[PDB]
Short mmCIF file of all heavy atoms in Angstrom, two decimals:
data_model
loop_
_atom_site.label_atom_id
_atom_site.label_comp_id
_atom_site.label_asym_id
_atom_site.label_seq_id
_atom_site.Cartn_x
_atom_site.Cartn_y
_atom_site.Cartn_z
N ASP A 1 -197.27 -122.60 142.13
CA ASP A 1 -197.79 -123.77 142.84
C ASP A 1 -198.75 -124.50 141.98
O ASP A 1 -199.41 -123.92 141.14
CB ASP A 1 -198.50 -123.25 144.12
CG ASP A 1 -198.73 -124.40 145.16
OD1 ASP A 1 -199.63 -125.26 144.98
OD2 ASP A 1 -197.95 -124.38 146.18
N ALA A 2 -198.84 -125.76 142.19
CA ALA A 2 -199.69 -126.68 141.39
C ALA A 2 -201.12 -126.36 141.69
O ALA A 2 -201.99 -126.40 140.80
CB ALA A 2 -199.34 -128.13 141.72
N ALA A 3 -201.42 -126.02 142.92
CA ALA A 3 -202.78 -125.84 143.39
C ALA A 3 -203.34 -124.57 142.82
O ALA A 3 -204.48 -124.54 142.23
CB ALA A 3 -202.83 -125.82 144.94
N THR A 4 -202.53 -123.49 142.90
CA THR A 4 -202.99 -122.19 142.38
C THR A 4 -202.76 -122.14 140.87
O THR A 4 -203.55 -121.51 140.17
CB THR A 4 -202.22 -121.12 143.16
OG1 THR A 4 -200.84 -121.37 142.82
CG2 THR A 4 -202.29 -121.31 144.69
N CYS A 5 -201.77 -122.81 140.44
CA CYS A 5 -201.33 -122.71 139.05
C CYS A 5 -200.69 -121.30 138.85
O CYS A 5 -200.55 -120.85 137.71
CB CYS A 5 -202.48 -122.91 138.06
SG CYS A 5 -201.99 -123.57 136.40
N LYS A 6 -200.31 -120.73 139.98
CA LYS A 6 -200.09 -119.29 140.01
C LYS A 6 -198.86 -118.99 140.90
O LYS A 6 -198.52 -119.77 141.77
CB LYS A 6 -201.38 -118.57 140.48
CG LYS A 6 -201.59 -117.26 139.69
CD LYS A 6 -203.05 -116.83 139.74
CE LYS A 6 -203.45 -116.56 141.19
NZ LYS A 6 -204.80 -115.90 141.24
N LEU A 7 -198.26 -117.81 140.62
CA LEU A 7 -196.97 -117.55 141.18
C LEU A 7 -197.04 -117.61 142.68
O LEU A 7 -197.85 -116.96 143.33
CB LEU A 7 -196.40 -116.24 140.62
CG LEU A 7 -196.32 -116.14 139.11
CD1 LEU A 7 -196.29 -114.66 138.66
CD2 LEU A 7 -195.09 -116.84 138.58
N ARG A 8 -196.16 -118.43 143.28
CA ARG A 8 -195.87 -118.33 144.70
C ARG A 8 -194.99 -117.07 144.98
O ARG A 8 -195.38 -116.20 145.78
CB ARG A 8 -195.15 -119.60 145.20
CG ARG A 8 -195.85 -120.84 144.73
CD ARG A 8 -194.89 -121.78 144.02
NE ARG A 8 -193.66 -121.99 144.87
CZ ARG A 8 -193.64 -122.78 145.94
NH1 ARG A 8 -194.71 -123.52 146.35
NH2 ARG A 8 -192.53 -122.83 146.66
N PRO A 9 -193.79 -117.07 144.35
CA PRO A 9 -192.69 -116.30 144.87
C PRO A 9 -192.89 -114.82 144.63
O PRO A 9 -193.90 -114.39 144.11
CB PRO A 9 -191.44 -116.87 144.18
CG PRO A 9 -191.97 -117.59 142.96
CD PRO A 9 -193.49 -117.79 143.09
N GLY A 10 -191.85 -114.02 145.03
CA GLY A 10 -191.76 -112.66 144.64
C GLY A 10 -191.38 -112.53 143.16
O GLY A 10 -190.31 -112.00 142.88
N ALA A 11 -192.24 -113.07 142.32
CA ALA A 11 -191.86 -113.25 140.94
C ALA A 11 -192.73 -112.45 140.00
O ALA A 11 -193.74 -111.89 140.46
CB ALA A 11 -191.91 -114.79 140.62
N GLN A 12 -192.32 -112.37 138.73
CA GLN A 12 -193.11 -111.60 137.74
C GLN A 12 -193.86 -112.58 136.85
O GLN A 12 -195.09 -112.41 136.64
CB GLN A 12 -192.18 -110.71 136.93
CG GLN A 12 -191.46 -109.69 137.81
CD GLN A 12 -190.47 -108.86 137.01
OE1 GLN A 12 -189.39 -109.29 136.69
NE2 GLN A 12 -190.92 -107.63 136.68
N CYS A 13 -193.19 -113.57 136.35
CA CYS A 13 -193.75 -114.49 135.35
C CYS A 13 -193.29 -115.88 135.69
O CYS A 13 -192.45 -116.11 136.56
CB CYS A 13 -193.33 -114.08 133.88
SG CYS A 13 -191.54 -113.82 133.63
N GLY A 14 -193.92 -116.83 134.97
CA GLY A 14 -193.58 -118.25 135.16
C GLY A 14 -192.92 -118.82 133.96
O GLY A 14 -191.92 -119.57 134.08
N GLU A 15 -193.44 -118.48 132.82
CA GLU A 15 -192.94 -119.01 131.56
C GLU A 15 -192.92 -117.93 130.46
O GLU A 15 -193.55 -116.91 130.55
CB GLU A 15 -193.84 -120.19 131.08
CG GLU A 15 -193.63 -121.41 132.01
CD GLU A 15 -194.16 -122.68 131.38
OE1 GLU A 15 -193.62 -123.02 130.25
OE2 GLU A 15 -195.10 -123.32 131.91
N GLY A 16 -192.09 -118.24 129.42
CA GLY A 16 -191.80 -117.20 128.44
C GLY A 16 -190.34 -117.25 128.09
O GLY A 16 -189.49 -117.57 128.90
N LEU A 17 -190.05 -116.86 126.83
CA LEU A 17 -188.68 -117.00 126.31
C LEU A 17 -187.79 -115.91 127.00
O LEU A 17 -186.55 -116.12 127.09
CB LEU A 17 -188.66 -116.87 124.80
CG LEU A 17 -189.43 -117.96 124.02
CD1 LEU A 17 -189.62 -117.57 122.57
CD2 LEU A 17 -188.76 -119.30 124.19
N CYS A 18 -188.41 -114.86 127.51
CA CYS A 18 -187.69 -113.78 128.12
C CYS A 18 -187.94 -113.87 129.62
O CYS A 18 -187.55 -112.96 130.37
CB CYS A 18 -188.07 -112.43 127.53
SG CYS A 18 -186.99 -111.04 128.07
N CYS A 19 -188.63 -114.92 130.06
CA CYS A 19 -188.94 -115.12 131.46
C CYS A 19 -187.86 -115.97 132.05
O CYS A 19 -187.89 -117.22 131.93
CB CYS A 19 -190.34 -115.72 131.62
SG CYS A 19 -190.93 -115.77 133.38
N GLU A 20 -186.92 -115.33 132.76
CA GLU A 20 -185.84 -116.01 133.41
C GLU A 20 -185.87 -115.71 134.91
O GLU A 20 -186.05 -114.59 135.32
CB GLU A 20 -184.49 -115.65 132.79
CG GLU A 20 -184.53 -115.83 131.27
CD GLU A 20 -184.89 -117.26 130.87
OE1 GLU A 20 -184.34 -118.20 131.44
OE2 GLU A 20 -185.79 -117.39 129.96
N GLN A 21 -185.68 -116.82 135.70
CA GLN A 21 -185.75 -116.71 137.11
C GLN A 21 -187.17 -116.22 137.54
O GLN A 21 -187.30 -115.52 138.54
CB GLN A 21 -184.67 -115.77 137.70
CG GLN A 21 -184.13 -116.27 139.02
CD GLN A 21 -185.12 -116.05 140.17
OE1 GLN A 21 -185.19 -114.99 140.76
NE2 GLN A 21 -185.85 -117.11 140.46
N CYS A 22 -188.13 -116.66 136.77
CA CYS A 22 -189.52 -116.32 137.03
C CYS A 22 -189.69 -114.77 136.92
O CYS A 22 -190.57 -114.20 137.51
CB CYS A 22 -189.99 -116.83 138.38
SG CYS A 22 -189.59 -118.58 138.71
N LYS A 23 -188.74 -114.20 136.17
CA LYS A 23 -188.66 -112.75 136.10
C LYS A 23 -188.36 -112.33 134.68
O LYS A 23 -188.04 -113.12 133.83
CB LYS A 23 -187.60 -112.25 137.09
CG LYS A 23 -188.11 -112.31 138.57
CD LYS A 23 -186.98 -112.20 139.57
CE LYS A 23 -187.47 -112.43 140.96
NZ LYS A 23 -186.31 -112.59 141.91
N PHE A 24 -188.60 -111.01 134.44
CA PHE A 24 -188.36 -110.47 133.11
C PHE A 24 -186.85 -110.16 132.91
O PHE A 24 -186.30 -109.33 133.59
CB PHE A 24 -189.13 -109.12 133.05
CG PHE A 24 -190.59 -109.28 132.76
CD1 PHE A 24 -191.37 -110.05 133.56
CD2 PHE A 24 -191.18 -108.67 131.70
CE1 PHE A 24 -192.75 -110.20 133.35
CE2 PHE A 24 -192.55 -108.80 131.40
CZ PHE A 24 -193.35 -109.57 132.24
N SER A 25 -186.28 -110.93 132.00
CA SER A 25 -184.85 -110.85 131.76
C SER A 25 -184.48 -109.43 131.22
O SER A 25 -185.37 -108.70 130.80
CB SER A 25 -184.38 -111.88 130.76
OG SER A 25 -183.23 -111.47 130.04
N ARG A 26 -183.20 -109.13 131.30
CA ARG A 26 -182.74 -107.78 130.92
C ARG A 26 -182.81 -107.62 129.41
O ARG A 26 -182.78 -108.60 128.68
CB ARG A 26 -181.31 -107.56 131.46
CG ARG A 26 -180.29 -108.44 130.67
CD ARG A 26 -178.91 -108.18 131.14
NE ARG A 26 -178.39 -106.88 130.69
CZ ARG A 26 -177.97 -106.62 129.41
NH1 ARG A 26 -177.97 -107.58 128.51
NH2 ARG A 26 -177.57 -105.42 129.11
N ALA A 27 -182.81 -106.38 128.99
CA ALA A 27 -182.82 -106.03 127.60
C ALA A 27 -181.53 -106.43 126.97
O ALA A 27 -180.43 -106.09 127.46
CB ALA A 27 -183.18 -104.54 127.43
N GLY A 28 -181.62 -107.14 125.83
CA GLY A 28 -180.43 -107.39 125.01
C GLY A 28 -179.95 -108.83 125.17
O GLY A 28 -179.20 -109.31 124.36
N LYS A 29 -180.43 -109.47 126.22
CA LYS A 29 -180.05 -110.84 126.54
C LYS A 29 -180.68 -111.77 125.48
O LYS A 29 -181.80 -111.50 125.04
CB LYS A 29 -180.38 -111.21 127.95
CG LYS A 29 -179.86 -112.55 128.31
CD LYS A 29 -179.99 -112.80 129.82
CE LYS A 29 -178.71 -112.27 130.60
NZ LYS A 29 -177.62 -113.25 130.51
N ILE A 30 -179.92 -112.76 125.09
CA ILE A 30 -180.35 -113.64 124.04
C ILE A 30 -181.47 -114.54 124.52
O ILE A 30 -181.32 -115.27 125.48
CB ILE A 30 -179.13 -114.44 123.50
CG1 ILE A 30 -177.99 -113.53 123.10
CG2 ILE A 30 -179.54 -115.38 122.38
CD1 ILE A 30 -178.50 -112.39 122.23
N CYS A 31 -182.60 -114.44 123.82
CA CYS A 31 -183.79 -115.18 124.22
C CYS A 31 -183.83 -116.45 123.33
O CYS A 31 -184.34 -117.47 123.75
CB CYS A 31 -185.05 -114.35 124.10
SG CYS A 31 -185.39 -113.70 122.42
N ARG A 32 -183.29 -116.28 122.11
CA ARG A 32 -183.33 -117.38 121.16
C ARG A 32 -181.97 -117.49 120.45
O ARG A 32 -181.39 -116.43 120.04
CB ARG A 32 -184.43 -117.14 120.13
CG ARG A 32 -184.88 -118.47 119.52
CD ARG A 32 -185.95 -118.28 118.44
NE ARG A 32 -187.29 -118.12 119.13
CZ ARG A 32 -187.97 -117.00 119.12
NH1 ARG A 32 -187.38 -115.79 118.92
NH2 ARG A 32 -189.28 -117.02 119.38
N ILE A 33 -181.52 -118.69 120.23
CA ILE A 33 -180.35 -118.93 119.42
C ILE A 33 -180.75 -119.09 117.93
O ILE A 33 -181.71 -119.80 117.66
CB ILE A 33 -179.62 -120.16 119.93
CG1 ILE A 33 -179.14 -119.97 121.39
CG2 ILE A 33 -178.41 -120.53 119.03
CD1 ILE A 33 -180.02 -120.83 122.36
N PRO A 34 -180.01 -118.37 117.05
CA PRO A 34 -180.32 -118.37 115.64
C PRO A 34 -179.87 -119.71 115.02
O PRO A 34 -179.23 -120.54 115.65
CB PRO A 34 -179.56 -117.13 115.08
CG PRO A 34 -178.52 -116.78 116.10
CD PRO A 34 -178.86 -117.53 117.43
N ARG A 35 -180.23 -119.84 113.74
CA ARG A 35 -179.59 -120.88 112.93
C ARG A 35 -179.46 -120.37 111.47
O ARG A 35 -180.26 -119.60 111.00
CB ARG A 35 -180.44 -122.10 112.92
CG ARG A 35 -181.84 -121.87 112.30
CD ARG A 35 -182.74 -123.09 112.52
NE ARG A 35 -184.13 -122.77 112.08
CZ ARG A 35 -185.03 -122.06 112.79
NH1 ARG A 35 -184.68 -121.60 114.02
NH2 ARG A 35 -186.21 -121.89 112.32
N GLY A 36 -178.41 -120.83 110.82
CA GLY A 36 -178.05 -120.31 109.48
C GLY A 36 -177.61 -118.86 109.54
O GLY A 36 -176.63 -118.52 110.22
N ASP A 37 -178.35 -118.04 108.82
CA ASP A 37 -177.93 -116.68 108.57
C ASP A 37 -178.76 -115.74 109.42
O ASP A 37 -178.60 -114.53 109.30
CB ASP A 37 -178.16 -116.31 107.08
CG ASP A 37 -179.59 -116.58 106.58
OD1 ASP A 37 -180.15 -117.65 106.76
OD2 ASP A 37 -180.11 -115.56 105.96
N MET A 38 -179.53 -116.25 110.30
CA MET A 38 -180.49 -115.47 111.06
C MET A 38 -179.77 -114.73 112.16
O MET A 38 -178.78 -115.21 112.69
CB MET A 38 -181.55 -116.40 111.70
CG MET A 38 -182.73 -116.59 110.73
SD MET A 38 -182.21 -117.64 109.32
CE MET A 38 -183.73 -117.59 108.39
N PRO A 39 -180.34 -113.56 112.53
CA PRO A 39 -179.90 -112.81 113.71
C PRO A 39 -180.39 -113.44 114.99
O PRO A 39 -181.46 -114.13 114.98
CB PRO A 39 -180.44 -111.40 113.51
CG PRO A 39 -181.55 -111.50 112.51
CD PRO A 39 -181.41 -112.87 111.83
N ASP A 40 -179.65 -113.30 116.05
CA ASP A 40 -180.08 -113.73 117.36
C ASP A 40 -181.21 -112.77 117.86
O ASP A 40 -181.16 -111.58 117.67
CB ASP A 40 -178.94 -113.63 118.40
CG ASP A 40 -178.22 -112.33 118.45
OD1 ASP A 40 -177.29 -112.15 117.57
OD2 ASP A 40 -178.50 -111.46 119.29
N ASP A 41 -182.21 -113.42 118.48
CA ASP A 41 -183.34 -112.66 119.02
C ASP A 41 -183.02 -112.25 120.45
O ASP A 41 -182.36 -113.01 121.21
CB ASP A 41 -184.61 -113.48 119.09
CG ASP A 41 -185.92 -112.71 119.32
OD1 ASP A 41 -185.72 -111.50 119.71
OD2 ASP A 41 -187.00 -113.25 119.15
N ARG A 42 -183.46 -111.03 120.80
CA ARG A 42 -182.97 -110.40 122.07
C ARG A 42 -184.18 -109.98 122.87
O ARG A 42 -185.22 -109.61 122.34
CB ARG A 42 -182.09 -109.19 121.75
CG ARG A 42 -180.77 -109.58 121.14
CD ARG A 42 -180.02 -108.40 120.52
NE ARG A 42 -178.69 -108.82 120.02
CZ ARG A 42 -177.88 -108.01 119.38
NH1 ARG A 42 -178.20 -106.69 119.17
NH2 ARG A 42 -176.71 -108.44 119.00
#
């Protein structure tokens, strides 16, 4: 919420690369797309 700046829902997090659905995404899921020769971050 704007007023609280703080989680309304039954949620874990608000923002973050691994923060999906206001929640902590599962292990192994791609958090970042690589470029060039780099590995994908998980």
Side-chain angles (χ1 to χ4, degrees):
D1 196 284
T4 62
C5 207
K6 219 159 60 170
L7 303 158
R8 311 127 50 76
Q12 299 176 281
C13 52
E15 290 196 60
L17 298 167
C18 191
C19 188
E20 309 302 314
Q21 219 285 277
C22 311
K23 286 166 187 166
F24 280 57
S25 152
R26 69 180 287 282
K29 187 169 274 278
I30 306 312
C31 60
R32 204 182 278 112
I33 301 106
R35 62 190 174 279
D37 52 311
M38 272 71 182
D40 51 277
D41 194 347
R42 292 167 176 176

